[PDB]
Each structure stands twice: as structure tokens, then as C-alpha cells.
Design an enzyme around this catalytic site. Sequence first.
Site, short mmCIF file in Angstrom:
data_model
loop_
_atom_site.label_atom_id
_atom_site.label_comp_id
_atom_site.label_asym_id
_atom_site.label_seq_id
_atom_site.Cartn_x
_atom_site.Cartn_y
_atom_site.Cartn_z
N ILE B 19 0.84 -1.19 0.00
CA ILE B 19 0.00 0.00 0.00
C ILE B 19 0.88 1.25 0.00
CG2 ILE B 19 -1.60 1.39 1.38
CD1 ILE B 19 -3.05 -1.35 2.00
N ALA B 94 1.33 -8.53 13.77
CA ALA B 94 0.90 -9.40 14.86
C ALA B 94 1.44 -10.81 14.53
CB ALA B 94 -0.61 -9.43 14.99
N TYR B 156 -8.97 -12.27 11.56
CA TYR B 156 -8.27 -11.01 11.75
C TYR B 156 -8.01 -10.83 13.24
CZ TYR B 156 -6.82 -6.29 10.47
OH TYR B 156 -6.10 -5.15 10.22
N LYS B 163 -6.43 -2.27 15.40
CA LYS B 163 -6.91 -1.26 14.47
C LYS B 163 -7.92 -0.31 15.11
CE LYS B 163 -4.65 -2.22 10.67
NZ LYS B 163 -3.49 -1.39 10.25
N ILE B 192 -6.34 -6.17 -0.12
CA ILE B 192 -5.40 -6.08 -1.23
C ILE B 192 -4.33 -7.13 -0.96
CG2 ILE B 192 -3.70 -4.63 -2.41
CD1 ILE B 192 -5.23 -2.18 -1.43
N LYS B 193 -3.97 -7.91 -1.98
CA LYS B 193 -2.92 -8.90 -1.81
C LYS B 193 -1.57 -8.20 -1.65
CE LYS B 193 -1.62 -13.30 -1.62
NZ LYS B 193 -2.01 -14.01 -0.36
N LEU B 195 2.26 -8.51 0.92
CA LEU B 195 3.05 -9.45 1.72
C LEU B 195 2.43 -9.75 3.10
CD1 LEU B 195 6.66 -8.31 0.76
CD2 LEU B 195 5.73 -10.64 0.49
N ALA B 196 2.07 -8.70 3.83
CA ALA B 196 1.47 -8.85 5.15
C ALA B 196 0.14 -9.58 5.14
CB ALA B 196 1.28 -7.49 5.81
N1 LIG Z 1 -3.41 -5.26 2.25
C1 LIG Z 1 -4.61 -5.04 2.78
O1 LIG Z 1 -5.60 -5.66 2.40
C2 LIG Z 1 -4.84 -4.00 3.85
C3 LIG Z 1 -6.14 -3.55 4.09
C4 LIG Z 1 -6.37 -2.58 5.06
C5 LIG Z 1 -5.30 -2.09 5.79
N2 LIG Z 1 -4.05 -2.53 5.56
C6 LIG Z 1 -2.97 -1.95 6.36
O2 LIG Z 1 -2.09 -1.32 5.44
C7 LIG Z 1 -0.84 -1.15 6.09
C8 LIG Z 1 0.26 -1.63 5.16
O3 LIG Z 1 0.22 -3.05 4.96
P1 LIG Z 1 0.26 -3.65 3.47
O4 LIG Z 1 -0.99 -4.47 3.33
O5 LIG Z 1 0.71 -2.64 2.46
O6 LIG Z 1 1.38 -4.81 3.66
P2 LIG Z 1 2.98 -4.74 3.40
O7 LIG Z 1 3.43 -6.08 3.91
O8 LIG Z 1 3.34 -4.26 2.02
O9 LIG Z 1 3.39 -3.61 4.46
C9 LIG Z 1 3.40 -3.88 5.85
C10 LIG Z 1 4.58 -3.07 6.35
O10 LIG Z 1 4.59 -3.05 7.77
C11 LIG Z 1 5.96 -2.97 8.15
N3 LIG Z 1 6.32 -3.31 9.54
C12 LIG Z 1 6.00 -4.45 10.16
N4 LIG Z 1 6.52 -4.48 11.39
C13 LIG Z 1 7.20 -3.32 11.56
C14 LIG Z 1 7.99 -2.73 12.64
N5 LIG Z 1 8.19 -3.33 13.84
N6 LIG Z 1 8.51 -1.51 12.41
C15 LIG Z 1 8.36 -0.84 11.25
N7 LIG Z 1 7.66 -1.34 10.21
C16 LIG Z 1 7.07 -2.56 10.33
C17 LIG Z 1 6.60 -4.01 7.22
O11 LIG Z 1 8.05 -4.03 7.13
C18 LIG Z 1 5.94 -3.63 5.92
O12 LIG Z 1 6.73 -2.64 5.25
C19 LIG Z 1 -0.96 -1.93 7.39
O13 LIG Z 1 -1.30 -1.01 8.42
C20 LIG Z 1 -2.10 -2.88 7.17
O14 LIG Z 1 -2.72 -3.28 8.39
C21 LIG Z 1 -3.80 -3.46 4.62
O1 LIG Z 2 -4.43 -5.07 8.36
C1 LIG Z 2 -4.58 -5.79 7.23
C2 LIG Z 2 -5.83 -6.10 6.73
C3 LIG Z 2 -5.93 -6.86 5.56
CL1 LIG Z 2 -7.53 -7.27 4.91
C4 LIG Z 2 -4.82 -7.31 4.87
C5 LIG Z 2 -3.55 -7.02 5.34
C6 LIG Z 2 -3.41 -6.26 6.49
O2 LIG Z 2 -2.18 -5.97 6.99
C7 LIG Z 2 -1.64 -6.84 7.88
C8 LIG Z 2 -2.23 -8.06 8.20
C9 LIG Z 2 -1.60 -8.90 9.10
C10 LIG Z 2 -0.40 -8.55 9.69
CL2 LIG Z 2 0.38 -9.65 10.83
C11 LIG Z 2 0.23 -7.36 9.42
C12 LIG Z 2 -0.37 -6.50 8.53
CL3 LIG Z 2 0.39 -4.98 8.12
#
Ligand SMILES: NC(=O)c1ccc[n+]([C@@H]2O[C@H](COP(=O)([O-])OP(=O)(O)OC[C@H]3O[C@@H](n4cnc5c(N)ncnc54)[C@H](O)[C@@H]3O)[C@@H](O)[C@H]2O)c1
Ligand SMILES: Oc1cc(Cl)ccc1Oc1ccc(Cl)cc1Cl
Lengths: 257, 257, 257, 257
Positions: B19, B94, B156, B163, B192-193, B195-196
Site C-alpha cells: 500500500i 501481529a 483477523y 486497528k 489487497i494482496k 506481503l502482510a
Molecule cells: N493489504 C490489505 O488488504 C490491507 C487492508 C487494510 C489495511 N491494511 C494496512 O495497510 C498497512 C500496510 O500493509 P500492506 O498491506 O501494504 O502490507 P505490506 O506487507 O506491504 O506492508 C506492511 C509493512 O509493515 C511494516 N512493519 C512491520 N513491522 C514493523 C515494525 N516493527 N517496524 C516498522 N515497520 C514494520 C513491514 O516491514 C511492511 O513494510 C498496514 O497497516 C495494514 O494493516 C492493509
Molecule cells: O491489516 C490488514 C488487513 C488486511 Cl484485509 C490485509 C492485510 C493487512 O495488513 C496486515 C495483516 C496482518 C499482519 Cl500480521 C500485518 C499486517 Cl500490516
Amino acid sequence: GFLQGKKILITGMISERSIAYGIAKACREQGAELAFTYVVDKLEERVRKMAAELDSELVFRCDVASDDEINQVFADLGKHWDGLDGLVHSIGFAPKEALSGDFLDSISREAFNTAHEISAYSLPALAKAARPMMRGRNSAIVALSYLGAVRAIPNYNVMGMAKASLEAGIRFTAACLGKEGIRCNGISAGPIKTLAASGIADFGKLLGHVAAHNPLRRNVTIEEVGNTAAFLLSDLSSGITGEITYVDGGYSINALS
Amino acid sequence: GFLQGKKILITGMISERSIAYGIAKACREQGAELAFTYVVDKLEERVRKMAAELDSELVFRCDVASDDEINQVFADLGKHWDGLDGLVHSIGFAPKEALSGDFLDSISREAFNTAHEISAYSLPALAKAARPMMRGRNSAIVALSYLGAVRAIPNYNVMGMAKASLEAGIRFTAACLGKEGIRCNGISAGPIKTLAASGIADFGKLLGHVAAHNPLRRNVTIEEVGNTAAFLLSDLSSGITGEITYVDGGYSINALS
Amino acid sequence: GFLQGKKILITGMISERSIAYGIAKACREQGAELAFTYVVDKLEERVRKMAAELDSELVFRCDVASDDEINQVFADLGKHWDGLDGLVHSIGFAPKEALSGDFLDSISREAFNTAHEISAYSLPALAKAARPMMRGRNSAIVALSYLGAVRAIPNYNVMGMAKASLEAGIRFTAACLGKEGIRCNGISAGPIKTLAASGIADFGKLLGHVAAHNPLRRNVTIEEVGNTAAFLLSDLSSGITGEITYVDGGYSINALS
Amino acid sequence: GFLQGKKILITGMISERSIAYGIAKACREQGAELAFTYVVDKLEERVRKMAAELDSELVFRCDVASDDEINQVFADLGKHWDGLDGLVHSIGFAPKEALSGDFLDSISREAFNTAHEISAYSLPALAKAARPMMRGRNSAIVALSYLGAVRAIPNYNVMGMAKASLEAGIRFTAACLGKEGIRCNGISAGPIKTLAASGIADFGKLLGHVAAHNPLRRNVTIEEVGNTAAFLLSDLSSGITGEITYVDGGYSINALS
Ligand SMILES: NC(=O)c1ccc[n+]([C@@H]2O[C@H](COP(=O)([O-])OP(=O)(O)OC[C@H]3O[C@@H](n4cnc5c(N)ncnc54)[C@H](O)[C@@H]3O)[C@@H](O)[C@H]2O)c1
Ligand SMILES: Oc1cc(Cl)ccc1Oc1ccc(Cl)cc1Cl
Ligand SMILES: NC(=O)c1ccc[n+]([C@@H]2O[C@H](COP(=O)([O-])OP(=O)(O)OC[C@H]3O[C@@H](n4cnc5c(N)ncnc54)[C@H](O)[C@@H]3O)[C@@H](O)[C@H]2O)c1
Ligand SMILES: NC(=O)c1ccc[n+]([C@@H]2O[C@H](COP(=O)([O-])OP(=O)(O)OC[C@H]3O[C@@H](n4cnc5c(N)ncnc54)[C@H](O)[C@@H]3O)[C@@H](O)[C@H]2O)c1
Ligand SMILES: NC(=O)c1ccc[n+]([C@@H]2O[C@H](COP(=O)([O-])OP(=O)(O)OC[C@H]3O[C@@H](n4cnc5c(N)ncnc54)[C@H](O)[C@@H]3O)[C@@H](O)[C@H]2O)c1
Ligand SMILES: Oc1cc(Cl)ccc1Oc1ccc(Cl)cc1Cl
Ligand SMILES: Oc1cc(Cl)ccc1Oc1ccc(Cl)cc1Cl
Ligand SMILES: Oc1cc(Cl)ccc1Oc1ccc(Cl)cc1Cl
């Protein structure tokens, strides 16, 4: 009495001003049998005395910082009771210095961790430990929250984050336990002068603003909160779970009054 | 563009699926100058390379578990930039075991503490550390949240509590910093697909359910989230603070579709 | 300009204080081509003159009480434009006597009906009439609401019910149209001195309270509302539908300040 | 019981499946004295017979389309009762054709007007007409709503807009009457097979989806709704006003289950 035959464990009763005391009294008036926890040994005598007035001799030490103490409560209580019909979470803590003045200046990692562990994690921790005694009993959990979960409020600061975590905890616990016959609900109470309330800087002003601005034009009582908890612990509320009910005289739904 | 010359620090960019990458690209398209953080040394090269493609050579290590590292970022950044106009929180964590199966069975004290510290506390921690560089600039903070804040969602689990804490953090930060000319807003993104995302048990089914049931009948993109963040970082959104904006194709406002 | 190539129809622009004027100006600054409606013949000259300053000669009469007039707007507009990319609902009405003093004393069936028909039904009515021109265009609808939808507010009275109806209308319209590439969103604006605002008894006090109590410690501008509408009308917001965005300087998320 | 001697007027009881019947029975179980309304003469005998089983001979015709009939109810009731302690709004209507299929295709001005007048305006209309009999008694009003107020739902269509209007009505009525000792609250009930429910296209599938997806994994009963209304009508809930309480087995707070 609509809690006849219900056995209810109440956390957080430390004085007759406590929300938990109002809950206890309301539940006992509806026929519930009660048990209580207290955080430290220094409080044991005070809590045993209040419990006795409420017809209970079941009192247990429980610092929710400790998984061992949490589990030990249900082990001990289980020697007396077949099951647990009600669980009242009426506990919170954050360091006083984190609840005064500028939100960011006053916050720290350590205060954040403590506030969340004691105020929020304790709900799933207690639900989890109580689960063997509560499942299949058409039982219920009630936890106390505050408007700071969903609105920014001066001085409440990091406790607002912890209450938001708590309310989500209520929803996830409800979703988790609903199939096995345990409900989990919240009460978001308006301000009430309690021992813990003095930890919030300028609490007296919060209290005054609410009475001046809510639909009822007065603050709520521990009896009002208590009667609501009694309802949510009773089979009368069997259609309700994962809900946060506001007992603040309408304050949260009013604006610009 | 509408961020021309604005200096924005972005956390969480670890791949082109992130993201934070979508945010970065959207901001750079609107003229922003960017800087980036990365959690550990093993990622430095990858992040430097992505940063270079976005015209930046400003990259700093920051594990938000460490107050030392958080504050060191702004000390180091401050050697290059005289102030900071934008701050992007796009980070979460987490333990994977806590995000699989029954909420109470999978939760633990340690997992709760980690999830909240990394996912929620990190927002006020970064805001606080950035404050000297941001104040008086009509600057802005954006953080990423998810529906688990306000709804129970399978798997979740404890991240939902974190959150919720985060969203309250956004509100309190907004209230705290508004007089000083710093805004703070959230985006609640649809799935969104990334890594996390693979840490959430059965994420592929979650992703599929949303696309089948939201008003748009599809999932959102990191460009859609990114463009929203760019707006919320810009002076165009100067009337907006403490807001959580849903970029989930309407999923949250639909039921029984 | 992020609305280059977008053709946007704007209702409700009656003076340079109008929210719709701020929207119009913001959209034109981002490259949109505009068209306008006016409620009665007496306003035609004034609106044509404002439209000309915004580089438009497309102005149509439309009392939203009339299905014939609503439909006739799109028939006429369709002679000039291939399609419609944006639709701005910035209109409301209730009899002044219903917006003064005690809610129940001031309400009547007739005032309720008028308020809802003009303020709320007009959104699906316009969306429905616009649908042939908007579908498949990746187009967008924005409507203006107010906090009275979700909070009780003195004197706003029956308009609060109409705004709640409107916000639900936004959600249902979004759910209805999302698959065919039309989005529908709301802006809940803070108080702004406009012509219509004088219909609310004691508007000056609402305006003053918000500036004293919101995170920004000031009221919002029609430029701030306008820039938000421009974003919601643009492809930058393509991941967002059925959303109500608060442009009130954080007022709604603050309490007891 | 906790309504002993309280005098409560109940609208909407047309069969033993009616939500209003569940409310009536729950109130009578707690000691309330009841009175009832019926929409048309054809129903008088059926309603008198149900009323008799609930120990009441007080039954009045009331089509809420008619201000004459609304006010005549209280004139006639006032010959028997010196005041009124409770008022139950359990009524709704929209043309069946508006509740089937595409929201915009199915809507019309006339259907919108009818739905809002009968489903939403009727709450302040009844509150207003009852006010002389209710004020100063620490009395209470309860009205029935549905999730369509706050979520888009297939087929519920324009009734969603009407329910949103209703819920705002509840808030404004609460704010209006709170100083005079009248509370006003809502229950948002989950789906229940009632006569009116058959007006919603594909109601059986809606009913089935909720039972499959809510925390309780079952639908709620009219007894569950009824007991909640009894609580909200009683002095036990004296700290609660302007509240919408969900009696849907947690459906609204769950997602992606
Ligand atoms: N992908 C989704 O579907 C989705 C949906 C809603 C919200 N989010 C939120 O979006 C944000 C970004 O996640 P993403 O989905 O782009 O995944 P991503 O894996 O691309 O990014 C997650 C990031 O969190 C960082 N991180 C984890 N532990 C950390 C620490 N101790 N210190 C500093 N950085 C740390 C990771 O290195 C990584 O860069 C998160 O807050 C996630 O909860 C994601
Ligand atoms: O919050 C999220 C919500 C969705 Cl639907 C997809 C990815 C997300 O992002 C995470 C999900 C799990 C962990 Cl352990 C860390 C992060 Cl950043
Ligand atoms: N008083 C109010 O205005 C108000 C308003 C809304 C919500 N609440 C909430 O109501 C609940 C009860 O608070 P109260 O106002 O009755 O105050 P109180 O001081 O009477 O009770 C607070 C309780 O928390 C307990 N506690 C603190 N740390 C603990 C630990 N580690 N382990 C176990 N117990 C611990 C205390 O011992 C005490 O019994 C709290 O959750 C509070 O946040 C209070
Ligand atoms: N000014 C504020 O503080 C404020 C705050 C929040 C929301 N709003 C909303 O913003 C929107 C615009 O209002 P404004 O404050 O700019 O006032 P304004 O007086 O500038 O505009 C109100 C418009 O509604 C139009 N209108 C009224 N009846 C109509 C009918 N039958 N058919 C067609 N048009 C009709 C008027 O002609 C006028 O152009 C309204 O929906 C209002 O409720 C205003
Ligand atoms: N059954 C459900 O699943 C459900 C769920 C949530 C909310 N509700 C709400 O519950 C309330 C009661 O409906 P119910 O489901 O018990 O159905 P029901 O058919 O038993 O009751 C509906 C009542 O509305 C009355 N009514 C209709 N038009 C009227 C008019 N012009 N004047 C006076 N009364 C009129 C009918 O005569 C009937 O008594 C309604 O507000 C409905 O929207 C129902
Ligand atoms: O949550 C509360 C909200 C209010 Cl208005 C008053 C008291 C409250 O309870 C607390 C406040 C501060 C601390 Cl340190 C601990 C607790 Cl239990
Ligand atoms: O909705 C509004 C909210 C505010 Cl705070 C100010 C003005 C508003 O707009 C109106 C108010 C009253 C009437 Cl009769 C018509 C309109 Cl358009
Ligand atoms: O509001 C309701 C919601 C549900 Cl799930 C079921 C029944 C309901 O009640 C009605 C539905 C349609 C009509 Cl025309 C009238 C009424 Cl009273």
C-alpha cells in the site's frame, strides 16, 4: 426478579461509588447470586465486607496483569459454582501522568502498553478463562467503556485508544462465543464520580459539561448503569450481543445543545 | 501537481505490492519529494532501489518497536529537510498464530501486546517524534486501518482490537495537533494482496468475498488507496481531520448483497 | 488539473456564498467543464452570470419537486454532452417555521413531506434521471449533508430527519449503481454562512460553537468543501463509494473540548 | 414486575406474529396495563380479541396517515387514563412494488412520500400527540427500526431511507423531550417472519442469510425484541435516551463470517 438463578462474577468493586457496586446492587435486587474479585491484598477486607452486604462470601484476588491469577479465579470459583451465568468487566487502568494534558506529550510506550493490557486485553483474557464455566449456559459478559473509544476527549488521552480496543474486543468476543451460548456486550457510561475518575485531569469539568448538554440535562447514576448491566446479563437481552449501549442520558447522540 | 514541493516521509514500503508503494507513487505523481523508512537492514537495498525509482535517496532504518530508532529517523532526516509536510503510517504486525482460527484460542497476552505496540502505538509515536518538524506547516498525517476496527471478522482476530486502537489514535492525534496546523486522518482500505496479507488465515477467501459483495463488485487497488492518501496529505483536504475514509469499494456500507 | 475532461452538472449555486459555488470553482480550477441548474425563473440571470465566469453557458431550470423538470434537464443537457461524468446535489429545503424552536411543536406532516421530498428524495430522483448519461462512464455523484443526520441539534429539527434519509439514499444509490460505474458519496460539511443557513434559527450560535470546539479551532470554507467534492468527483476517488466524508474541521469526532 | 401499573399504548399489533404482540406480551408479563391501536375497521375485532387475552379493553382506530385519528386516540384514551407512561411505535408501510429489485427503478416520488410519512413521520406525530399525557411522568417511547437505516440492503430499497429518517426522529424526539421526563429509544430488530415482512422481495433469503451469518447463528424472536422494549419502557433504562439498540443476534457488528 429477572436474574433469579443467575450466578454472576463481578470485577472492579472497590467502593460504594464504584460502577461495579451499582451493578452488584442492581443484580442482587433482581435475585442474582454474586461473587467478586479484588486487585490486591490491601483491598480484601473492604471487598469482603461489601460482598457480605450483598449476601456473598465468594471473593477472589485477581490482578488481570497475571494469567495465573485470572485462571485461578475460575478454578476456585468452580469449587462452589456449577457454571457461570454472568461476568462483569468493570476495570481499567492507565498511569495518571498519561491522562493529563497534551495527548502526545503525555503518552509513552510503557503507558500505552499498560493501559491496553489492563483496560482492553483483560476482556478477552477473562472471557477466555471463564469460557469452560460459561459455555452452553446461555450466559453473558458485560464490559464498561467510555465515549473516548469513538471521540477525542481532553485528558482521557491513551485511555481512549484502550477503550476502542476494548469495544472491538467486545465485538470479536461476541462473534467468537455466540454459537456456544455466551453473549458479550458493552455499556458506554456517562461520567460518574468514582475513585478511578480522579485519575483524569479536569474530570469535574467533563462531568459538568455532560449534565449541561445531554438530553436528560443531568448525569447518570451507578444505579442506571447497574440496571442496564443487569438487563444485559439477563435472559431478557438474549437477542443482543456485540452491542455497545450508551448510558449517558443521551449525551453521545446530541450536538451543539 | 497538488503536492508540488511537499516533503513526505513514508513508512512501510517493502515491495511494489505495498500500500505504501501505491501511496508513494501517487504522491510523487503530484509533485511530492519523498523519503522512506525500512524495518531491518536486510531490506535496505530493496527499499533504496524503489526509492531511487521515485527520485529519492532519503532512506532510513526504523523498527517502530524502538523509540531510539523512531526519533533517530527525524534527527537524520532533519539534516536534509528543514521541515516535514507529510507523514505516512503504513505498517502493522501481529504474530501469525494469533490471526488464525478461534479468536480466544488464538489470542495471548504477548500477541496482544505486540499487535498493539507495532500496529497502534506506532501512530502516536511517529506523530510525536515528527511534531517539531511538522508543526506550523499546514502538514498532514495519514494512517492505514481496516474494517476489523469496527466489525468482527474471522481470523483477523486481535488485529481488529489493534486497528480500533489505531483509529482512536487518529482521532486523539487530530484533536491534539489541530491548533498547530497538523492534520491526522485514516484510510480504511479494502483487502489487497500484499506481503502482510498472507499472515491472515484464509486471506484469499476474504479477498474474494469482498469483490463478490461490495457495491463496485471488485477489490480496490493500491493506486486508489494511494490517490486518497495523496489527497489527505494535501492542502485540498485542509477541512478534514480525525476522519476515517473507507476505500473499500463501498463494502462497509453494504449488507446482505 | 485532476478533473480534466470531466463534465459535471451542479445543482444549488445561487450566490458566491453557496457551497455549490465553492464546488463549481474548485472543479473548474481542476479542469472540469460545468453545467448548472436553478430552481426558479427569477434566478436565471444571476446563475447564468456566475456560470459565465466559470466558463459555462449550460444552465437549466430545475425544481426538484417536478419529475418533468428533472428529466427535461438531462434531455436538454444531452444535446450538448455525450455523457455526464459528475453530478452535484447541493440542494435542500424545509419551511423556515419547522426549523425554529421545539422539534415537536415546530414539526408538521406538510413540513416533514416537503423537507424529505426536496432534501432527500431529490438525490435518487436526480441519480435516476441522470443514469442513462452517467452509466459506464466511471462517473460520480456527490451530495451535501449535515451532522443533523446522526446527532440531534437544536433548531435543525425536521431537516435532520431529511438528512438521515439523504445519507441512506447515498448508500442505496451507491449499492444500486456501483456495478455500472457510477459512484455516489456524501460530504457532511460543517457550518458555513450561506443563504439557506439563515433559515435555521440561531445559526450564528452553531457557527460559533463549532469554531470554538473543533480540532482545527475554526470553521471550514466553501473552498475546503469544494476541493473535497472535486476529489470525490474525480478518478482519484475511484475506490470510494457510499461514503459520507466530514469536512467540518474534525468537529464530529471531538467531544467535551 | 418492573412495569407494574405502568400504562402503555401499543401500535401495530395485528397478529400473534407481530413484533408489537411480543412487546405487548413482554410488557403485560412485567405488570403493565395496555391499550392498543389498529389501522382500519376490518381489524377491530381481531385486535380487540388479542387485547382481551392481554387483559385490555382499550382499543382505538388509528391510521397514522390521519392527524385527526392520531389526536383522537389520545382524546379517547384520556377518558380512561389520567396519563400515559409508555408509547410503542411498531408500524411501517411502503408500496410493495418499491421493495422489489433495482432501488432506482423501483422508487417513485409517491412511494417515497408514503414510506416516509407512514414509517418515519408517524414517530414524531405520535410523540407530539401523546406529549400532554406523557410529560412529567418519567415515561418512555420505543420505536422499531431496521439495519436498512445505516446499510444498503437488497430489496429493502426506499424503506431504508424511511428508517434512517425514523432513527434521526428518535434522536430529535429524545433531545426535545428529555427535560420533561420522556425518553425515546429505538430497537433495530433482526429479520422476523411477520405479515409486513412478505412485502420485501425475497424476504426468506434475507432471513436465512442472517441466521447463517450472525454471532448467535439464529434469528431473534418477538419475545427477545419484546423484552428489550419492556426494558426501554421501564425506569430501569432511565439513563438511556436517543439510543438505537440492535436486537439482531449481533448481525450488524459481524462481517465476512
Ligand atoms: N493489504 C490489505 O488488504 C490491507 C487492508 C487494510 C489495511 N491494511 C494496512 O495497510 C498497512 C500496510 O500493509 P500492506 O498491506 O501494504 O502490507 P505490506 O506487507 O506491504 O506492508 C506492511 C509493512 O509493515 C511494516 N512493519 C512491520 N513491522 C514493523 C515494525 N516493527 N517496524 C516498522 N515497520 C514494520 C513491514 O516491514 C511492511 O513494510 C498496514 O497497516 C495494514 O494493516 C492493509
Ligand atoms: O491489516 C490488514 C488487513 C488486511 Cl484485509 C490485509 C492485510 C493487512 O495488513 C496486515 C495483516 C496482518 C499482519 Cl500480521 C500485518 C499486517 Cl500490516
Ligand atoms: N466513572 C466513570 O465516569 C466511567 C465512565 C465510563 C466508563 N467507566 C469505566 O467503568 C469501569 C469501572 O470504573 P469506575 O469508574 O467504577 O472506577 P473504580 O475506581 O470504582 O473501579 C476501577 C476498578 O478497576 C480495577 N483495576 C485497576 N487495575 C486493575 C488490575 N490490574 N486488575 C484488576 N482490577 C484492576 C480497580 O481496582 C477498580 O476496582 C472502568 O472500565 C472505567 O473505565 C467509568
Ligand atoms: N451552509 C451550511 O452550513 C451547510 C452545512 C452542511 C450542509 N449543507 C447543505 O449544503 C447544501 C447547499 O446549501 P447551502 O448552505 O450552500 O445553501 P444555498 O442557499 O447556497 O443553497 C441551497 C440551494 O438549494 C436550492 N433549492 C431549494 N429548494 C429547491 C428545489 N425545490 N429545487 C431545486 N433546488 C432547490 C436553492 O435554490 C439553493 O440553490 C444543502 O443540502 C445544505 O443542506 C449546508
Ligand atoms: N419483522 C421484521 O423482520 C422487522 C425487523 C426490523 C424492524 N421491523 C419493524 O417492526 C415494525 C413492526 O412490523 P412487524 O414486522 O411486526 O410487521 P406487522 O405486519 O406485524 O406490523 C406492521 C404494522 O404496521 C401497521 N401499519 C401499517 N400502515 C399503517 C398506517 N397507515 N397506520 C397505522 N398503522 C399502520 C400495520 O397495520 C401493522 O399492524 C415495523 O416498523 C417494521 O418496519 C420489522
Ligand atoms: O474510563 C473512565 C471514564 C471516565 Cl469519564 C471516568 C472514569 C473512568 O475510568 C477510569 C479512568 C482512568 C483510569 Cl487510570 C482508570 C479508570 Cl477505570
Ligand atoms: O443543511 C444545512 C445545515 C447548515 Cl448547518 C446550514 C445550512 C443548511 O442548509 C439548509 C438549511 C435550512 C434549509 Cl430550509 C435549507 C438548507 Cl439547504
Ligand atoms: O422494516 C422491516 C424490516 C424487515 Cl427485515 C422485515 C419487515 C419489516 O417491516 C416492514 C417491511 C415492509 C413494509 Cl411495506 C412494511 C413493514 Cl412494517
